[PDB]
Design a binder for these strands. Structure first.
Ligand SMILES: [K+]
Ligand SMILES: [K+]
Ligand SMILES: [K+]
Ligand SMILES: [Mn+2]
Ligand SMILES: [Mn+2]
Ligand SMILES: [Mn+2]
Ligand SMILES: [Mn+2]
Ligand SMILES: [Mn+2]
Length: 136
RNA sequence: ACAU
DNA sequence: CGATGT
C-alpha cells in the first residue's frame, strides 16, 4: 500500500541469465549504496536475488537494525522463508562458486535468527526498486 | 498467470 | 526475443 521508506532495498544485476551475477543494497529513503557484491562469473537471477536478501539480513543484524528489507523477487523471498534456494542451475565446475555462496547463505539462515520483515517491492505501483541496475 |  | 522461478 504505502512504501516503508525506513528500509533496506536489495537487487540482483546480471549479464546474461545464467550469466555474470552481482547484487547491491541501498537505503530506500536516499538511494545511498550500503553494500555491493563482487561479480560472480556464472549464476542465475534468482540465486543473486536470494544472496542479496540474505546479505541484507546479515548486514542489518550486525548493526542491530530492525529495518525491513524490500525485494522485487517473489522467488527469492520464498526461498529465504523456506531457508532453501530451489535453483535449477546445474551444479558443475563453472557454477561451483555461486552454488558455494548459495549453500553458505542457506547454512547461515539455518544457524541464526532474525525478525527482519522481508517485504515485496510492488514494482507495478511504485516503479523499479531503488537497488535496480537500470539495465532493462 | 504471477514475480523476475 | 530468451532464461529463471512459484
Ligand atoms: K523488476
Ligand atoms: K534492470
Ligand atoms: K516463464
Ligand atoms: Mn530484482
Ligand atoms: Mn543447499
Ligand atoms: Mn532490477
Ligand atoms: Mn526495455
Ligand atoms: Mn524487457
Amino acid at each position: 500500500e504505502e512504501i516503508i521508506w525506513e528500509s533496506l532495498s536489495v537487487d540482483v544485476g546480471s549479464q546474461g541469465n545464467p550469466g555474470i551475477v552481482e547484487y547491491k543494497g541501498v537505503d530506500t529513503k536516499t538511494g545511498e549504496v550500503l553494500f555491493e557484491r563482487e561479480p560472480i562469473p556464472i549464476g542465475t537471477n534468482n540465486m543473486g536475488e536470494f544472496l542479496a536478501i540474505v546479505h541484507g539480513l546479515r548486514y542489518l543484524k550486525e548493526r542491530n537494525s530492525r529495518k525491513p528489507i524490500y525485494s522485487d523477487s517473489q522467488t527469492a523471498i520464498k526461498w529465504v522463508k523456506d531457508k532453501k534456494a530451489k535453483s535449477t542451475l546445474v551444479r558443475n565446475e563453472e557454477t561451483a562458486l555461486i552454488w558455494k555462496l548459495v549453500d553458505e547463505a542457506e547454512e547461515w539462515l539455518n544457524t541464526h535468527t532474525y525478525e527482519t520483515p522481508i517485504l515485496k517491492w510492488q514494482t507495478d505501483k511504485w516503479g523499479e526498486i531503488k537497488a535496480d541496475y537500470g539495465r532493462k
